[PDB]
């Protein structure tokens, strides 16, 4: 019975992985990444077949329901292996430009390939939070902003976060990053105007951190360089219709749940 | 004039640091600790005096009013310093076995010592949740459960949590730990009987986590070893008059506000 | 003007029964009991108002500033009488689980109550040593161990004794009973470990005596069955940090002041 | 017309038997016993109805006014007879724990009962000095010390004495027994300390005689074993506010009026 | 597949016990009791599960339709077992004062419970006549007077009977008990008025038997003390709209079916 | 009848293990230890008594005579066993800062203990050279300089050495270490002023080894790091009245007898 | 009137018994003995002596003096000294000289043989150079066929402008390091801080009442503590005490110390 294998750096954010092996194209999973937002080349997801078998084709469904932010990889391969060490490329893909949403990857093997594992592997870095719906073989109430990237980092390092959304608004929004360290008040960290042209920074981070967004892909990014331990905190991303009020706790009309960042000495 | 200095990994669960300077013995702070409940040795709390000065004595009140869980260090030292790099012991205390509650620590310096900083520093690890009431120099209630510890630790590491109480019941309670990731439901994790003799675990945490209690100190503990990303959640600790019903979301008659563990990758 | 009335078989261990009517909530009385530790059903404490009056309510404070062993009844009733032979319940209470200490009992009678006497009366046997603080109506610093239950019993009879502490230690003690007839040496009787899981009994009493502890309420007990007049003696309870040494006059670090037990024939 | 009947071995001390039949709950009779202080199985008190008649209830007040020493049986039965030789039981009782003072026993019978006789009969030996206030059917300042037990006894046998008190004290009192043969002195027999921990005896009695006290019930006892004809005398009980002075004649502050003991050859 | 189990001291009056397992709330079973009417602590009714299995919940429906006499325990507890020797409590219940008739007890084990046996068990003597309607698990007309109590007893013993009814009259009745030895004629034993204020007895049970009624519960009781062999008989309970004629064979308009009582030497 | 038993890492320097069993406080034994001078926690010395027996006390003399160097553990425990596998603590001693000399550990076991073994066991490490005098149950000459450490360690490691002395001079001595391989010359290793403020090391060793001394305790130590086979030799400690002549074969006025060090590959 | 009298003990006048009594010096028991303090300076000066008065002139085959005394404690013996005798008590001929420098504390036996007898009326030990120790002794014969203790010695009386050295010795020797300190308590007044020194001797402090006049020192090898007092003054009068603390900081407070001497009286006239 086929089980799911995938890059260890991903955490499940919504949904659960059983959804991926269930036959429904409308159940899915949304993944944050653990140490920095961008999916590296090398990263993979796909399935362990239990034992060597003779595949007549496959049907993997990547991305998920919703308008929302781009959710798939750009350049990837479909590869199968017998020893989980050595892999063999069946097909390269370029989905650069693809709209957000389910994409059905349905491949057909005229000549039944024989393999114990089969997966998709990223080929180039990809700054977007990945979602997926279904993975199988052929053997004949609202809106959420979501932050991602973020874990343990060494003093003086860099780490980068990303905010994505489940639906695409028809208006422009100012986006902002705040942080809260335990038992303290939520601080302002940075904001950016809807069109990207105006940005300001809290005093603590000026120089080190950089905010930015990509509207085509529908994500916002915070780059933290030269980190310190007093940077430890949960980081929230927030959406405000008014750039002037975007750097005030009582400004953002929409908040993410936050991603925890710790910097050790 | 004088300001408080204390350990950087503590944070305030209740009341606030001005209570510890207000001149009044019944205004306190109750601290929690980030990344492990236990208070390591080297941990400290005391005064930054402002400038080099002739001290005739100190009166520190440690522990805070109430007959709940144990709120004091066991073995600690009172030391002072001019530069805040080098410290000198005035005294050493062994308060092992002291009942919870205020402890007035009063000293005269027959010989006017001269310091800029003076504090209590911890000598052996303490698995309680520290409270405090006053810190001076001389110179010429409905029941609340509280989880502590919790922070971010990387996959495969360990973290331990504790749950204190603000009042001590004359009945005997089962205790449990639940967890709840955002959006998922609240899972049962581990329960323990009144007398610590019986315990049971949930399938996923079975054999990685251990639950214990120390009734004389009135704390419950949770040791998590071999941590996984799927362990990330808010951990709540709960009490229930019935060991059977304690593993059920509706068993407990009391709950903590929770603490956050995150496992990175 | 109104005066106190209570079960006869109690006697004052500490405080005075003036403190009961004195107006002050910090003055109380600590009570041992005579022929057996446990307060039985039927036992009472209350006022005789010295004539029939109209009552708007009562305020009885029970327990007494405590941070030690349970000092209250569990199930009692509040009742009044005209002639002292008929008693009519006004309210029944169930304080099972109550932390030790003051408990204010304040009642208002929308229509007045015509009463000559009014009291708390206990409904279920209780194994604790009772304390009390104040009894009004409305119209317009270091440790003690106390033993209780001592008195006089016919040969072949039974007696139960208990021992309470005034303060509750953060460390675990083994507890032991000893006895000492006048002019004789003090002879070990029984010992129980911290967690009550280990017990051993002096050669003289094996088979007739049981030692037990309830840690939640902070009491130790000695049940004496099949007594004979050789058992007559002052009975002491004591605590030793070490169980091994608990059965030797010099092990213990704190001693009770003992209750006399006398077996006639 | 109905007259009183009761155990022969008793005999009046205070008031007289006509107060027991006067309609008044506040007049009574206080009995001493002879040939032992304790009242035994079968001892009884009740009414000779004169002639055989029908009853709808009874009302017996037992004990006498005042919160002195305990004064009622513990376990007794209410029984009646036509012929006076054999008896049938109605209710049984357990007044163990009862306060001292009047206790009313109002019974009404669903079926009328006819009888020449009806009484209360003791079921279990009771070491107390018996009082009674009133006996009726239905047909539609200074304290005071008392010695009881003892009259005539064959040499080398045993006899038990008790001493009751009429008021009860806030304070603790050493209690002593003294005897006085006509013609001679008041010889000290035995004292006991307030708590009952300390006792001393006259050399004439040491090892044959035991003093003991029941501070609950409020009574002191002298158990006397293997008596000699020179033990003959008036035995008295006294109270001294100081145990040290309690074996001297001018020590006791309160003195009973003595009870005759006589040991024939 | 699951089998019923219940107290051995019960026998069925009406109903088939498979009714308790059909999954229908409107088909039930009325039980008589074997030795005396009153259900004692520890009695029980529940399921033999066949082998050890894992429950998610249970649904038990106690009492039976018809607003007759009360038909359920007051205090009782749901408990389970692995072996039939040992029982763990899931839930204690207080239904004091609940009205006659079915009552669905539904419970849900949020984590499964492993049991082979699960039942309800009485906690306090209950003087009714128990009826029950249905027992299940989850794992992924005319009026009848009924008599009960009564089996075999030693002479001189005691035994007590009850009469229940299946429907409640708005008219108020006199009740009476009658016995008949076989061949021998039906003999009057005792009667009671509707308000219980009036009673009379058959000549031979004079003094030894007591008739009584509880109208809130709708039961009548016969207490038999001091039994004789001659008391052997079937005892019938009867309703008569007129007390005067309740003692007469041709008086009572309603009759029970009888319960055998038997006295041996 | 009883045999001695001690840690294996030890060897007799003076006296023999008969003197510890001889019943003479004045005979005794002095021990060095292998592979490291210092005494590790869990090291022990005591008695095997063949059968298990009922002990009434013990009398152990630790240290032996002389006003030489410190000769006892600081923190240790008396413990017994029946199996030689698990051990129950009886007492625990803190002898920190006792004078050198013998010390009588006499314990009286008021309720007897049955053990097959009983020993003293070290708690914290102890940089001394242990001497001992007598071990009993109850049932009813110019100076010597001694070197300790010595053994066989492997390349790249670490080994420490102690020098102690049988008496203590009022003169203040420079101390030094010297080594020699068979066939070869005796070479200066390192030297320290009497007050320790002054060191100089040999050439083949500067940076690697450390010499230190504890005057209060009267010991000198040699800490060796990164040992080479070159380092194999007997090692000698020696005292010299002039720090300057102390690095010269001819200077020193008193010599050890060496302890054999052996590094291997 | 028939008598036989043994010889009798003689020693310098400055000394005074602290522990024991001198009967012990003559009782033929090595295990009894005497501890001496000195008045008017702690330190034994050259010329100080102890020995025997023989009663009349006599013929010695030898002597056996046991100096020091049963001690694991601080140093108890002179360093350089001579054995000498006299017939008149007015002049002395040296028999033997010793250099015991470096000796352990405790009893040292000095048994001496006299191949050809020496006849004398007095024979004794005499110090040869100043010794800052606190002298004990145990027996003196001829031949014819629980808890610890700190002790302050020195001073008594000395006038204005003067000088004085005090000393503290102990009956046993701890294996922990102690800070040591001096305190004075004038009559009726409170006990006052004086000076203190770290166990290792590298740190000291003096009360302002005395800084720059007094000096606190120690000899850890010998186990004694010294207090040099210069430029004195009548207001320096007090019983002086010495004390040990495990804490150099609490050392100067009237309650930090865990051991006190019974004190030595200093009195300064002008
Ligand atoms: C559940 N418990 C906390 C509790 C119990 N056992 C523990 N055991 C350990 N080891 N650690 C703990 N933190 C711990 N905590 C409680 C429960 C109630 C009250 C309390 O005040 N209870 C009720 C019941 C008493 C009443 O009737 O008033 C009350 O309101 O007083 C205090 C603590
Ligand atoms: C021994 N114990 C009494 C005690 C312990 N366990 C019990 N357990 C039961 N079941 N019943 C008891 N009566 C009982 N009593 C103690 C011991 C110390 C202190 C205490 O307050 N001691 C002071 C003195 C020293 C200190 O600070 O540690 C203290 O502060 O601890 C209180 C109670
Ligand atoms: C006699 N009574 C039984 C009855 C009455 N009082 C009691 N009182 C007590 N305490 N206990 C009882 N068991 C008890 N039982 C009755 C009488 C009639 C009906 C009844 O249902 N009768 C018919 C006919 C009478 C009518 O309804 O007009 C009907 O219509 O149902 C029920 C119960
Ligand atoms: C205070 N000290 C005296 C001491 C220490 N260092 C000194 N140093 C110098 N230079 N001069 C001194 N006079 C001096 N005196 C002490 C203190 C205690 C013990 C002693 O015997 N201590 C304890 C500790 C040993 C134990 O726990 O048994 C004991 O009871 O024996 C000895 C010397
Ligand atoms: C060299 N010294 C050993 C000594 C000195 N300081 C040390 N210091 C420390 N830290 N550690 C040591 N082991 C140590 N050992 C000695 C030397 C002689 C005597 C001694 O008994 N000397 C002779 C000879 C010198 C004399 O006493 O006149 C004697 O008479 O006893 C004692 C200890
Ligand atoms: Na799916
Ligand atoms: Na807004
Ligand atoms: Na405060
Ligand atoms: Na519950
Ligand atoms: Na009061
Ligand atoms: Na003791
Ligand atoms: Na009367
Ligand atoms: Na008197
Ligand atoms: Na049914
Ligand atoms: Na009729
Ligand atoms: Na020996
Ligand atoms: Na030399
Ligand atoms: Na001597
Ligand atoms: Na100290």
Author numbering:
A (entry chain C), B (entry chain A), C (entry chain B), D (entry chain F), E (entry chain D), F (entry chain G): 1 to 140, 174 to 298
G (entry chain E): -4 to 140, 174 to 298
What did the published study say regarding this structure?
Using several starting points, we evolved CID systems controlled by a therapeutic drug methotrexate. Biophysical and structural analysis of methotrexate-controlled CID system reveals the critical role played by drug-induced conformational change in ligand-controlled protein complex assembly. We chose the nanoCLAMP domain due to its small size (15 kDa), ease of recombinant production, and finally the lack of cysteine residues enabling its use in both oxidizing and reducing environments. While comparisons based on limited number of repeats must be treated with caution, the structural and biophysical analysis of the selected binders suggests that they exploit ligand-induced conformational changes in the anchor domain and do not form direct interactions with MTX.
These complexes were subjected to crystallization trials and several of them produced crystals, often with multiple crystal forms. We were able to collect diffraction data sets for complexes containing nanoCLAMP3 and nanoCLAMP8 complex and solve the structure to 2.9 and 1.8 Å resolutionrespectively, using molecular replacement. Although the variable loops of nanoCLAMP3 have very little similarity to that of nanoCLAMP8, the overall interface structure of its complex with VHH:MTX is remarkably similar.
